[PDB]
Protein backbone atom coordinates (compact mmCIF):
# COMPACT_ATOMS: atom_id res chain seq x y z
CA UNK A 1 0.00 0.00 0.00
CA UNK A 2 3.12 2.29 -0.11
CA UNK A 3 6.11 2.07 -2.46
CA UNK A 4 9.47 3.63 -1.62
CA UNK A 5 13.00 4.11 -2.99
CA UNK A 6 16.39 4.69 -1.36
CA UNK A 7 18.14 8.05 -1.86
CA UNK A 8 20.87 9.98 -0.05
CA UNK A 9 20.48 13.55 1.23
CA UNK A 10 23.33 15.87 2.13
CA UNK A 11 24.23 19.49 2.73
CA UNK A 12 27.89 18.98 1.76
CA UNK A 13 27.91 16.00 -0.67
CA UNK A 14 30.32 14.41 1.82
CA UNK A 15 28.18 13.21 4.74
CA UNK A 16 25.51 11.22 2.89
CA UNK A 17 22.42 10.37 4.95
CA UNK A 18 20.33 7.39 3.84
CA UNK A 19 16.60 8.08 3.43
CA UNK A 20 13.58 6.27 1.96
CA UNK A 21 11.18 8.43 -0.06
CA UNK A 22 7.49 7.89 -0.82
CA UNK A 23 6.91 7.78 -4.60
CA UNK A 24 3.46 9.32 -4.17
CA UNK A 25 4.77 12.45 -2.39
CA UNK A 26 6.95 15.27 -3.61
CA UNK A 27 10.48 15.74 -2.39
CA UNK A 28 9.06 18.97 -1.02
CA UNK A 29 6.54 17.45 1.38
CA UNK A 30 9.13 14.92 2.56
CA UNK A 31 12.39 16.88 2.68
CA UNK A 32 11.74 20.58 2.41
CA UNK A 33 13.48 22.32 -0.50
CA UNK A 34 15.40 19.74 -2.53
CA UNK A 35 17.88 20.05 -5.40
CA UNK A 36 19.18 17.28 -7.66
CA UNK A 37 22.26 18.44 -9.60
CA UNK A 38 21.10 22.02 -9.13
CA UNK A 39 17.54 21.31 -10.28
CA UNK A 40 14.87 22.46 -7.77
CA UNK A 41 13.03 19.11 -7.55
CA UNK A 42 10.92 20.36 -4.61
CA UNK A 43 7.63 20.30 -6.56
CA UNK A 44 8.31 16.88 -8.22
CA UNK A 45 7.63 13.33 -6.97
CA UNK A 46 10.26 10.56 -7.26
CA UNK A 47 10.66 9.27 -10.78
CA UNK A 48 12.01 5.73 -10.52
CA UNK A 49 15.43 6.64 -11.99
CA UNK A 50 16.23 8.42 -8.71
CA UNK A 51 17.19 5.32 -6.66
CA UNK A 52 20.67 5.79 -5.22
CA UNK A 53 21.04 9.43 -6.33
CA UNK A 54 22.19 12.18 -3.95
CA UNK A 55 20.05 15.24 -3.23
CA UNK A 56 20.85 18.55 -1.59
CA UNK A 57 18.55 19.77 1.16
CA UNK A 58 18.36 22.67 3.55
CA UNK A 59 19.73 22.22 7.08
CA UNK A 60 16.47 21.57 8.93
CA UNK A 61 17.95 19.82 12.00
CA UNK A 62 20.91 20.78 14.21
CA UNK A 63 23.22 18.08 12.85
CA UNK A 64 22.85 19.44 9.32
CA UNK A 65 23.30 23.05 10.50
CA UNK A 66 26.66 21.93 11.89
CA UNK A 67 27.41 19.71 8.85
CA UNK A 68 26.74 22.86 6.76
CA UNK A 69 28.73 25.37 8.79
CA UNK A 70 31.75 23.05 8.60
CA UNK A 71 31.48 22.80 4.79
CA UNK A 72 30.63 26.47 3.97
CA UNK A 73 31.26 28.59 7.13
CA UNK A 74 27.68 29.87 6.96
CA UNK A 75 24.69 29.68 9.26
CA UNK A 76 22.43 31.71 6.85
CA UNK A 77 19.71 29.33 5.60
CA UNK A 78 19.32 31.29 2.34
CA UNK A 79 22.87 30.28 1.34
CA UNK A 80 21.94 27.01 -0.33
CA UNK A 81 19.26 28.70 -2.41
CA UNK A 82 21.26 31.76 -3.45
CA UNK A 83 24.12 29.42 -4.45
CA UNK A 84 21.86 26.96 -6.36
CA UNK A 85 20.41 29.99 -8.14
CA UNK A 86 23.81 31.31 -9.24
CA UNK A 87 24.87 27.81 -10.29
CA UNK A 88 21.99 27.70 -12.77
CA UNK A 89 23.75 30.52 -14.63
CA UNK A 90 27.40 29.62 -14.15
CA UNK A 91 26.91 26.03 -15.36
CA UNK A 92 26.11 27.61 -18.77
CA UNK A 93 29.10 29.96 -18.92
CA UNK A 94 32.24 28.93 -20.80
CA UNK A 95 35.56 28.78 -18.95
CA UNK A 96 38.38 28.70 -21.52
CA UNK A 97 42.07 28.31 -20.95
CA UNK A 98 43.74 31.60 -21.79
CA UNK A 99 47.49 31.91 -21.37
CA UNK A 100 47.59 28.97 -18.99
CA UNK A 101 44.80 30.23 -16.70
CA UNK A 102 41.06 29.60 -16.26
CA UNK A 103 39.02 32.61 -17.43
CA UNK A 104 35.30 33.20 -18.10
CA UNK A 105 33.85 34.01 -21.50
CA UNK A 106 31.90 37.25 -21.15
CA UNK A 107 28.34 36.84 -19.91
CA UNK A 108 25.81 38.42 -17.53
CA UNK A 109 28.04 41.24 -16.22
CA UNK A 110 30.80 38.81 -15.13
CA UNK A 111 33.93 40.85 -16.04
CA UNK A 112 34.67 41.40 -12.34
CA UNK A 113 34.47 37.63 -11.57
CA UNK A 114 36.94 36.77 -14.33
CA UNK A 115 39.43 39.34 -13.06
CA UNK A 116 38.92 37.82 -9.62
CA UNK A 117 39.21 34.23 -10.85
CA UNK A 118 42.42 35.02 -12.75
CA UNK A 119 43.95 36.70 -9.72
CA UNK A 120 43.20 33.82 -7.38
CA UNK A 121 45.08 31.42 -9.69
CA UNK A 122 48.22 33.57 -9.19
CA UNK A 123 48.48 34.20 -5.43
CA UNK A 124 49.00 31.79 -2.53
CA UNK A 125 45.71 31.25 -0.77
CA UNK A 126 44.27 28.52 1.39
CA UNK A 127 40.54 28.94 2.04
CA UNK A 128 39.14 27.54 5.26
CA UNK A 129 35.64 26.43 4.17
CA UNK A 130 36.04 23.03 2.47
CA UNK A 131 33.37 24.13 0.00
CA UNK A 132 35.64 26.97 -1.15
CA UNK A 133 38.86 25.02 -1.36
CA UNK A 134 37.33 22.10 -3.27
CA UNK A 135 35.78 24.51 -5.78
CA UNK A 136 39.05 26.48 -5.89
CA UNK A 137 40.96 23.33 -6.88
CA UNK A 138 38.36 22.20 -9.37
CA UNK A 139 38.36 25.68 -10.91
CA UNK A 140 42.12 25.49 -11.47
CA UNK A 141 41.36 22.46 -13.63
CA UNK A 142 38.71 24.28 -15.75
CA UNK A 143 35.51 23.38 -13.82
CA UNK A 144 34.95 26.84 -12.39
CA UNK A 145 31.11 26.87 -12.34
CA UNK A 146 30.81 25.91 -8.66
CA UNK A 147 33.66 28.21 -7.71
CA UNK A 148 31.98 31.24 -9.29
CA UNK A 149 28.58 30.32 -7.87
CA UNK A 150 30.04 30.16 -4.33
CA UNK A 151 31.67 33.58 -4.82
CA UNK A 152 28.30 35.04 -5.81
CA UNK A 153 26.75 33.40 -2.74
CA UNK A 154 29.47 34.61 -0.34
CA UNK A 155 29.17 38.13 -1.68
CA UNK A 156 25.35 38.31 -1.47
CA UNK A 157 25.68 39.46 -5.06
CA UNK A 158 23.73 37.85 -7.87
CA UNK A 159 24.34 37.24 -11.57
CA UNK A 160 23.90 40.55 -13.41
CA UNK A 161 25.05 42.76 -10.57
CA UNK A 162 28.27 44.49 -11.63
CA UNK A 163 30.89 43.75 -9.02
CA UNK A 164 33.93 45.40 -7.54
CA UNK A 165 37.04 43.19 -7.68
CA UNK A 166 38.60 44.56 -4.48
CA UNK A 167 35.46 44.00 -2.45
CA UNK A 168 34.96 40.55 -3.99
CA UNK A 169 38.42 39.60 -2.75
CA UNK A 170 37.80 41.06 0.67
CA UNK A 171 34.66 38.92 1.04
CA UNK A 172 36.77 35.85 0.21
CA UNK A 173 39.87 36.60 2.29
CA UNK A 174 37.68 36.58 5.43
CA UNK A 175 37.54 32.79 5.03
CA UNK A 176 41.15 32.40 3.93
CA UNK A 177 43.89 31.31 6.32
CA UNK A 178 45.85 34.53 6.62
CA UNK A 179 46.30 33.91 10.36
CA UNK A 180 50.12 34.20 10.08
CA UNK A 181 50.07 37.39 7.97
CA UNK A 182 51.52 40.37 9.79
CA UNK A 183 51.95 44.02 8.82
CA UNK A 184 53.72 46.57 10.99
CA UNK A 185 53.69 50.15 9.83
CA UNK A 186 54.95 53.43 11.23
CA UNK A 187 53.18 56.77 10.93
CA UNK A 188 55.22 59.91 11.53
CA UNK A 189 53.92 63.45 12.20
CA UNK A 190 55.96 66.65 12.19
CA UNK A 191 53.99 67.63 15.33
CA UNK A 192 52.68 64.57 17.22
CA UNK A 193 55.64 62.25 16.56
CA UNK A 194 55.78 58.60 15.51
CA UNK A 195 53.35 55.78 16.32
CA UNK A 196 53.83 52.14 15.40
CA UNK A 197 50.70 50.27 14.40
CA UNK A 198 50.69 46.50 13.97
CA UNK A 199 47.85 44.71 12.16
CA UNK A 200 47.27 41.17 10.97
CA UNK A 201 45.16 38.77 8.91
CA UNK A 202 43.10 40.29 6.08
CA UNK A 203 44.24 43.73 7.21
CA UNK A 204 47.93 42.82 6.81
CA UNK A 205 47.76 42.05 3.08
CA UNK A 206 45.26 44.69 1.79
CA UNK A 207 45.78 48.43 1.37
CA UNK A 208 43.69 51.14 -0.24
CA UNK A 209 45.32 54.44 -1.19
CA UNK A 210 48.40 53.69 -3.36
CA UNK A 211 49.19 51.20 -6.11
CA UNK A 212 52.98 51.23 -5.77
CA UNK A 213 54.23 48.73 -3.25
CA UNK A 214 57.49 50.67 -3.58
CA UNK A 215 55.80 53.94 -2.59
CA UNK A 216 54.42 52.12 0.46
CA UNK A 217 57.91 51.30 1.80
CA UNK A 218 59.20 54.80 1.04
CA UNK A 219 56.26 56.56 2.72
CA UNK A 220 52.77 57.76 1.75
CA UNK A 221 51.01 60.97 2.78
CA UNK A 222 47.99 60.56 5.06
CA UNK A 223 46.13 63.31 6.99
CA UNK A 224 46.63 63.41 10.76
CA UNK A 225 43.74 63.82 13.20
CA UNK A 226 45.84 66.39 15.02
CA UNK A 227 45.66 68.38 11.80
CA UNK A 228 48.89 68.36 9.81
CA UNK A 229 49.79 66.00 6.96
CA UNK A 230 51.48 62.77 8.08
CA UNK A 231 53.57 60.03 6.45
CA UNK A 232 52.85 56.28 6.71
CA UNK A 233 55.36 53.60 5.66
CA UNK A 234 55.80 49.83 5.91
CA UNK A 235 58.29 48.54 8.48
CA UNK A 236 57.56 44.79 8.45
CA UNK A 237 55.47 42.48 6.30
CA UNK A 238 55.19 38.70 6.59
CA UNK A 239 52.69 37.44 3.98
CA UNK A 240 53.01 35.64 0.62
CA UNK A 241 51.40 38.49 -1.44
CA UNK A 242 50.03 42.00 -0.95
CA UNK A 243 47.06 43.74 -2.61
CA UNK A 244 47.60 47.46 -3.31
CA UNK A 245 44.42 49.25 -4.36
CA UNK A 246 43.50 52.82 -5.23
CA UNK A 247 40.72 54.43 -7.28
CA UNK A 248 41.25 54.07 -11.07
CA UNK A 249 43.98 56.27 -12.52
CA UNK A 250 46.50 56.08 -15.34
CA UNK A 251 49.42 53.93 -14.17
CA UNK A 252 52.39 52.30 -15.87
CA UNK A 253 53.06 48.57 -15.47
CA UNK A 254 56.59 47.27 -16.12
CA UNK A 255 57.24 43.61 -17.11
CA UNK A 256 58.42 41.78 -14.00
CA UNK A 257 57.78 44.39 -11.28
CA UNK A 258 54.40 42.91 -10.21
CA UNK A 259 52.26 39.76 -10.47
CA UNK A 260 48.94 40.96 -11.98
CA UNK A 261 46.52 43.90 -11.91
CA UNK A 262 42.88 44.95 -12.40
CA UNK A 263 42.35 47.36 -15.28
CA UNK A 264 39.05 49.19 -14.85
CA UNK A 265 37.62 51.53 -17.49
CA UNK A 266 34.44 53.59 -17.05
CA UNK A 267 32.57 55.25 -14.19
CA UNK A 268 32.04 54.15 -10.59
CA UNK A 269 29.76 51.10 -10.66
CA UNK A 270 29.23 50.79 -14.46
CA UNK A 271 32.72 50.28 -15.94
CA UNK A 272 34.40 47.16 -17.37
CA UNK A 273 37.38 45.20 -16.05
CA UNK A 274 40.22 43.46 -17.84
CA UNK A 275 43.11 41.45 -16.35
CA UNK A 276 46.78 42.36 -16.84
CA UNK A 277 49.37 39.73 -15.95
CA UNK A 278 53.17 39.86 -16.14
CA UNK A 279 54.68 36.75 -17.74
CA UNK A 280 57.56 36.75 -20.26
CA UNK A 281 55.72 39.85 -21.55
CA UNK A 282 52.62 41.74 -20.44
CA UNK A 283 49.33 39.96 -21.18
CA UNK A 284 45.78 41.26 -21.13
CA UNK A 285 42.97 38.78 -20.54
CA UNK A 286 39.45 40.02 -21.31
CA UNK A 287 37.30 36.93 -20.74
CA UNK A 288 38.09 34.76 -23.75
CA UNK A 289 40.28 37.48 -25.35
CA UNK A 290 44.05 37.96 -24.89
CA UNK A 291 46.57 40.56 -26.11
CA UNK A 292 50.33 41.10 -25.65
CA UNK A 293 52.53 44.16 -25.28
CA UNK A 294 56.03 45.17 -24.24
CA UNK A 295 54.80 47.97 -21.93
CA UNK A 296 51.42 48.95 -20.51
CA UNK A 297 50.03 52.37 -19.57
CA UNK A 298 46.40 52.55 -18.53
CA UNK A 299 43.64 52.78 -15.86
CA UNK A 300 44.61 50.46 -12.98
CA UNK A 301 42.81 50.05 -9.65
CA UNK A 302 44.44 46.97 -8.00
CA UNK A 303 48.00 45.61 -8.29
CA UNK A 304 49.08 42.37 -6.59
CA UNK A 305 52.70 41.68 -5.60
CA UNK A 306 54.70 38.77 -4.20
CA UNK A 307 56.26 38.88 -0.74
CA UNK A 308 57.77 36.49 1.79
CA UNK A 309 59.23 38.65 4.61
CA UNK A 310 60.14 42.34 4.35
CA UNK A 311 61.82 44.69 6.81
CA UNK A 312 62.44 48.40 6.23
CA UNK A 313 65.91 49.88 6.61
CA UNK A 314 64.54 53.30 7.68
CA UNK A 315 65.94 54.07 11.14
C1 LIG B 1 32.59 48.25 -10.67
C2 LIG B 1 31.97 48.44 -9.28
C3 LIG B 1 30.85 47.66 -8.85
C4 LIG B 1 30.29 47.84 -7.54
C5 LIG B 1 30.82 48.80 -6.65
N1 LIG B 1 30.28 49.06 -5.25
C6 LIG B 1 31.12 50.00 -4.35
C7 LIG B 1 30.74 50.15 -2.87
N2 LIG B 1 30.33 48.89 -2.22
C8 LIG B 1 29.79 49.14 -0.93
C9 LIG B 1 29.34 48.16 -3.03
C10 LIG B 1 29.82 47.88 -4.44
C11 LIG B 1 31.92 49.56 -7.11
C12 LIG B 1 32.47 49.41 -8.40
C13 LIG B 1 33.71 50.25 -8.80
O1 LIG B 1 33.65 51.16 -9.67
N3 LIG B 1 34.92 49.99 -8.16
C14 LIG B 1 36.19 50.58 -8.26
C15 LIG B 1 36.29 51.97 -7.47
C16 LIG B 1 36.47 51.87 -6.05
C17 LIG B 1 36.57 53.04 -5.18
N4 LIG B 1 36.48 54.31 -5.73
C18 LIG B 1 36.28 54.43 -7.16
C19 LIG B 1 36.22 55.73 -7.72
C20 LIG B 1 36.01 55.90 -9.11
C21 LIG B 1 35.89 54.81 -10.01
C22 LIG B 1 35.97 53.53 -9.47
C23 LIG B 1 36.17 53.32 -8.02
C24 LIG B 1 37.26 49.48 -8.68
C25 LIG B 1 36.87 50.54 -9.69
ZN1 LIG C 1 22.46 33.82 -16.97
ZN1 LIG D 1 30.94 43.63 -16.84
ZN1 LIG E 1 34.99 31.47 7.87
ZN1 LIG F 1 49.44 65.55 13.81
Outline of the structure:
With 315 residues, the chain is of the alpha+beta class. The protein is 24% helix and 33% strand. The chain has a domain of 55 residues: Roll (Ubiquitin-like (UB roll)), CATH 3.10.20.540.
Explain this structure to me?
It is classed as hydrolase. The entry lists the keywords SARS CoV-2, papain-like proteinase, NSP3, hydrolase. The assembly is monomeric. There is one protein chain. This protein has helices spanning 27-31, 62-72, 79-90, 111-120, 130-140, 145-155, 165-173, 213-218, and strands at 4-10, 17-22, 34-36, 39-40, 54-57, 182-189, 193-200, 206-208, 220-223, 229-238, 241-253, 260-265, 272-278, 282-286, 289-293, 296-306, 309-311. It has 315 residues and is α+β, with helices and mostly antiparallel strands. It has a domain at 4-58: Papain-like viral protease, N-terminal domain (Ubiquitin-like (UB roll)). The strands form three sheets. The protein has a seven-stranded mixed sheet with strand order 8-11-16-12-13-14-15, with helices on one face. The protein has a five-stranded mixed sheet with strand order 2-1-5-3-4. Strands 6, 7, 9, 10 and 17 form a five-stranded antiparallel sheet that branches. Strand 1 and strand 2 form a beta hairpin. The chain is elongated, with a radius of gyration of 23 Å. One zinc ion binds next to loops.
Amino acid sequence: EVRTIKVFTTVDNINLHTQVVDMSMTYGQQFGPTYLDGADVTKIKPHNSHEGKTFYVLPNDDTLRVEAFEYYHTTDPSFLGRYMSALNHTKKWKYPQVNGLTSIKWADNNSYLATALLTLQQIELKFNPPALQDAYYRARAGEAANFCALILAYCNKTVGELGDVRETMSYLFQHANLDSCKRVLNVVCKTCGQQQTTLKGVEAVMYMGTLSYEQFKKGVQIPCTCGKQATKYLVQQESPFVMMSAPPAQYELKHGTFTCASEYTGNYQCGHYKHITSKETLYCIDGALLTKSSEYKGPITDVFYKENSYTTTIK
